[PDB]
């Protein structure tokens, strides 16, 4: 993408979103990042949407194959060869490559050039998310360091967002939702997850009165995700 203009890459990423071609969208946004300039709010959201749909497809595939593999590893299952394991490993390697790509973009050099609280919290939330995606498939030795990388990114984002953003900010709400999911699914801390979700919901509820109608809609939509997770876990 080094020969295409930055504006053209953004425009084509938008076209790809409209056509539901998220691999193309991700490659376009990667080229845009590689142009070296800081991203706007809209461009950050495009990058996140693109890589989120790519990894989402790969993670769903991984879960399907992992469940097939673990049923093939039960008592009474007929030996089928190494095919399921090999294909699960291939999908896993591809997922890991996508996460490594995102984290390399964040490290060179999105995070270190983000001074504003909104952009920095956004990038650290992404970092925590993609280390969490790596942690979902990790099995040995580096597992604990991957988990702590996710925890560290999430924690720094939480600190900055508590200091510099209102409790109704959608980025803060989504960050708290994802950090609670990390606590529940990854860190084996369901009480921390529930506590975080209820505290975030309540403090945003208390400040809903300051918001305009559209900001109100934006914040309540994510508070509903928090309430969904709470209803599932309680």
């Amino acid at each position: 993408m080094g020969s295409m203009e930055r504006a053209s890459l953004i425009q084509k990423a938008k076209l790809a979103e409209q056509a539901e071609r998220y691999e193309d969208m991700a490659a376009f946004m990667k080229g845009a990042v590689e142009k070296g300039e800081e991203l706007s709010c809209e461009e950050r959201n495009l990058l996140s949407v693109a890589y989120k749909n790519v990894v989402g497809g790969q993670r769903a595939a991984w879960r399907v194959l992992s469940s097939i593999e673990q049923k093939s590893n039960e008592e009474g299952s007929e030996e089928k060869g190494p095919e399921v394991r090999e294909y699960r490993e291939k999908v896993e390697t591809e997922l890991q490559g996508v996460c490594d790509t995102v984290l390399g973009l964040l490290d060179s050099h999105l995070i270190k050039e983000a001074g504003d609280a909104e952009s920095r919290v956004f990038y650290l939330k992404m970092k925590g998310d993609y280390y969490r995606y790596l942690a979902e498939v990790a099995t040995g030795d580096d597992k604990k360091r991957i988990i702590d990388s996710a925890r560290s990114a999430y924690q720094e984002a939480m600190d900055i967002s508590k200091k510099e953003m209102p409790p109704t900010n959608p980025i803060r709400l989504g960050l708290a939702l994802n950090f609670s999911v990390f606590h529940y699914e990854i860190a084996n801390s369901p009480e921390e997850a529930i506590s975080l979700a209820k505290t975030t919901f309540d403090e945003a509820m208390a400040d809903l009165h300051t918001l305009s109608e559209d900001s109100y809609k934006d914040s309540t939509l994510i508070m509903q995700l928090l309430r969904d997770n709470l209803t599932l876990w309680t």
């Binding site: 998310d129 709400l173 989504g174 939702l177 994802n178 999911v181 529940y184 699914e185 994510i222 995700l225 928090l226 969904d228 997770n229 599932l232 876990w233």
Partner: peptide
């Protein structure tokens, strides 16, 4: 399935 963002 639990919600994430």
């Amino acid at each position: 399935r639990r919600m994430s963002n």
